[PDB]
Amino acid sequence: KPHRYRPGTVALREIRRYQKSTELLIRKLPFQRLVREIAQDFKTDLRFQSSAVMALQEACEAYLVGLFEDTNLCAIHAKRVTIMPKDIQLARRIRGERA
Amino acid sequence: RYRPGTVALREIRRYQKSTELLIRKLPFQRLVREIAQDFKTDLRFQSSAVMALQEACEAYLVGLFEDTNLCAIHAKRVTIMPKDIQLARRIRGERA
Amino acid sequence: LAGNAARDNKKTRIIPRHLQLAIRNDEELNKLLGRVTIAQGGVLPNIQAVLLPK
Amino acid sequence: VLRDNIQGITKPAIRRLARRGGVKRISGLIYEETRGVLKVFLENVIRDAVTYTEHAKRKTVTAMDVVYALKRQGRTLYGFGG
Amino acid sequence: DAPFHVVITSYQLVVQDVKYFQRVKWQYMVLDEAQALKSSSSVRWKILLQFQCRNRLLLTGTPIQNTMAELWALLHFIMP
DNA sequence: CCCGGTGCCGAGGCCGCTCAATTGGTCGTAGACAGCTCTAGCACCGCTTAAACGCACGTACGCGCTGTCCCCCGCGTTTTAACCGCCAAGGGGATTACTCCCTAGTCTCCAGGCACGTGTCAGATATATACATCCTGTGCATGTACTCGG
DNA sequence: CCGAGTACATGCACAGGATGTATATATCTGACACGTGCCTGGAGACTAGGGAGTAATCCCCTTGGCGGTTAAAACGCGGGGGACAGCGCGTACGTGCGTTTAAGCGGTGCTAGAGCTGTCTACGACCAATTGAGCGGCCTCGGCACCGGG
């Protein structure tokens, strides 16, 4: 009696929604703390600008979006609807990052 | 019996060890002059230019065959396919 | 690394093959020169595990 | 006979290129596709090199123009100068 | 073109080269030291019987009285 | 998802000042163009033959199907913190003072880059011997079946 | 009818031998390798002149730090559809053999233009004065953010 959608319907709905809008999908403050952690490890006593942090967030989110596109292409080429760490490693391998 | 493939495999190993251009010089040069004829008529070519084109071309095809073979292996197949090539160039960024 | 590769090849003279082995065998030298093609240097011998018989 | 220069790249030659590329088994449709990608590559490099040759007011394409075309295409090569 | 008549083939070279040798027709065969045919289950017996031939000749001093299977194999090879 | 209402802060237009763009004027130098040449690119043709093309055959790999087992997916409720405003003050930037570093010019001079000929010298090919792996043949021991005796 | 035993078949292990493999060696040759002098483009030394950024303050925004509010992250559940393994059918992709072709060689002939060179010159860096296009700043306003019913 409780209504439940079949698996993948809400997934495609989220594909159309998040592909539809421009908003950032990563929370601001945790990503800022990660940037301050890595940058703090590289060089101590560093200060940052909001525009720089938002730039890192834009570049990172877009890079992960494209990497998820090529990864999905790797899974579909593998005849699987589910992406896998081997699909990611193949995507970065053909991209030449880890090659 | 000893495992076959023998000589042929040995010649693959030796032909990989000794380095030479695998594409035929005169046909590749005719292809280069034909492709350049469309861009500019009555062109002349230097031997070092043609050899450079053959080196870069053969190297590009070797790397593309490596990534293509990686696509085939990722497909659970030991045979490369035009879809493996198209995926290789797609992830490379040369198309689509 | 080129002289090391030449000693591994039992040669007292550096050849483009030795330069290719030295550049490609090193990770950082392969990162900078990965877009560079070495003439008459060949490539590192490689055989995939799935291509081996039996 | 009458045959195309793009067909001048032989199936055993592509087979040797794949053997150097570490390919044990090659499909029959690989050769024509490889000829196509090859033609695309030469159309990409030769266009830029010939463009340098035209900017140089020369009717002879040199090796330096090739090295520069590969350089701006990320194909940069060593040993031919530059 | 067939500019040859008599040839000499090694025992192992006939097993490894049997692919090339089975494609040619021979009207006769000669065997020196034929004691290698004492075993009927060996590959040399079936390989020798696979080639099409008319007459066969085997010259050996082998002691066929030791095992009856050796004399029976030599008689069944020429006359099956 | 589309539609009518309200609302607000960011878009877009005006004011004013200044510093860069512009106008005028000079020197010289890299270049445009013609003159000469000599290398290398082009064309051609024949002897050699290695590679390519075509075809046969079958063996192993693609690929399609099926079945299990689970590992994500959708939904409900529960817990954490991201997010939106104030308040010091710590830095990022204006303003002034001043010197070590580089620019520019002109001789004086060590150094490398070829033209040429000479002498080595690794090292590209091949050949053969030494090593090793397994394929085949031979021999010995054990097991199963049939025959005979009690 | 059952058990003992002899005979024939068979299977496993060891040793010989053949073929594949790899390195050690030999040798003549393209190419590193090494003088011999040239010189002209460099490399540095030595005065004189310029100049921009270092250093010290100091005014002023933009950070980093306090307490709430709900909105999203998280935890769980259940079953469902997707991954992965097993298996088999088919065909095509590999390998070998024979026929065919044009690729590699290097020998000769010819001239086209990349390159060196020599002369004369218009264009732009450069410097000084003048002018208005652009930009910080400020304010008014309206395009779209937000929202609740269809």
UniProtKB/Swiss-Prot annotation, chain B:
Modified residues (N6-(beta-hydroxybutyryl)lysine): 17, 40, 83
Residue positions where N6-succinyllysine is found in the record: 17, 40, 83
Modified residues (N6,N6-dimethyllysine): 40
One Gene Ontology term, aspect cellular component: nucleoplasm
Modification N6-acetyllysine occurs at: 17, 40, 76, 83
Modified residues (Phosphotyrosine): 2
Predominant location category: nucleus
Protein name listed in UniProt: Histone H3.1
Sites of N6-lactoyllysine modification: 17, 40
Phosphoserine: modified positions: 18, 47
N6,N6,N6-trimethyllysine: modified positions: 17, 40
Quaternary structure (record): The nucleosome is a histone octamer containing two molecules each of H2A, H2B, H3 and H4 assembled in one H3-H4 heterotetramer and two H2A-H2B heterodimers. The octamer wraps approximately 147 bp of DNA. Interacts with TONSL; CHAF1A; CHAF1B; MCM2 and DNAJC9. Interacts with NASP; NASP is a histone chaperone that stabilizes and maintains a soluble pool of Histone H3-H4 dimers.
N6-(2-hydroxyisobutyryl)lysine: residues carrying this PTM: 17, 25, 40, 83
Coiled coil (residue ranges): none
Role played: Core component of nucleosome. Nucleosomes wrap and compact DNA into chromatin, limiting DNA accessibility to the cellular machineries which require DNA as a template. Histones thereby play a central role in transcription regulation, DNA repair, DNA replication and chromosomal stability. DNA accessibility is regulated via a complex set of post-translational modifications of histones, also called histone code, and nucleosome remodeling.
Keyword list, A-Z: Acetylation, ADP-ribosylation, Chromosome, Citrullination, Disease variant, DNA-binding, Hydroxylation, Lipoprotein, Methylation, Nucleosome core, Nucleus, Phosphoprotein, Ubl conjugation
Source organism: Homo sapiens (Human)
N6-glutaryllysine modifications at: 17, 40, 76, 83
Swiss-Prot record, chain C:
Residues annotated with N6-(2-hydroxyisobutyryl)lysine modification: 10-11, 31, 54
N6-succinyllysine carried by residues: 31
Compartments where found: Nucleus; Chromosome
Modified residues (N5-methylglutamine): 40
Residues bearing the modification N6-crotonyllysine: 54
Complexes and interactors: The nucleosome is a histone octamer containing two molecules each of H2A, H2B, H3 and H4 assembled in one H3-H4 heterotetramer and two H2A-H2B heterodimers. The octamer wraps approximately 147 bp of DNA.
Function: Core component of nucleosome. Nucleosomes wrap and compact DNA into chromatin, limiting DNA accessibility to the cellular machineries which require DNA as a template. Histones thereby play a central role in transcription regulation, DNA repair, DNA replication and chromosomal stability. DNA accessibility is regulated via a complex set of post-translational modifications of histones, also called histone code, and nucleosome remodeling.
Protein family according to the UniProt entry: Belongs to the histone H2A family.
Name of this protein: Histone H2A type 1-B/E
Species assigned in the record: Homo sapiens (Human)
Primary gene name: H2AC4
Curated annotation (Swiss-Prot), chain D:
Residues of the full protein shown: 22 to 103 of 103
Domain of life: Eukaryota
Covalent link location (Glycyl lysine isopeptide (Lys-Gly) (interchain with G-Cter in ubiquitin)): 71
Any one of the GO CC terms: membrane
Modified residues (N6-succinyllysine): 11, 57, 59, 71
Recorded family membership: Belongs to the histone H4 family.
Modification after translation (UniProt): Acetylated as part of spermatogenesis progression prior to histone-to-protamine exchange. Demethylation is performed by JMJD6.
GO biological process: chromatin organization; negative regulation of megakaryocyte differentiation; nucleosome assembly; protein localization to CENP-A containing chromatin; telomere organization
Listed name of the protein: Histone H4
Swiss-Prot record, chain E:
Tissue: According to PubMed:10574462, widely expressed. According to PubMed:16298340, specifically expressed in brain, liver and pancreas.
Subcellular location as annotated: Cytoplasm; Nucleus; Cytoplasm, Cytoskeleton, Spindle; Chromosome
Biological role stated in the UniProt entry: ATPase component of the chromatin remodeling INO80 complex which is involved in transcriptional regulation, DNA replication and DNA repair. Binds DNA. As part of the INO80 complex, remodels chromatin by shifting nucleosomes. Regulates transcription upon recruitment by YY1 to YY1-activated genes, where it acts as an essential coactivator. Involved in UV-damage excision DNA repair. The contribution to DNA double-strand break repair appears to be largely indirect through transcriptional regulation. Involved in DNA replication.
Entry domain remark: The DBINO region is involved in binding to DNA.
Family: Belongs to the SNF2/RAD54 helicase family.
Miscellaneous information on this protein: Although the ATP-dependent helicase activity displayed by the INO80 complex requires INO80 ATPase activity, it is likely that the helicase function is carried out by the other components of the complex, RUVBL1 and RUVBL2, and not by INO80 itself.
Protein name per the record: Chromatin-remodeling ATPase INO80
Organism: Homo sapiens (Human)
Top-level taxonomy: Eukaryota, Metazoa, Chordata, Craniata, Vertebrata
Gene symbol of the encoding locus: INO80
Full-sequence portion shown in this chain: 621 to 700 of 1556
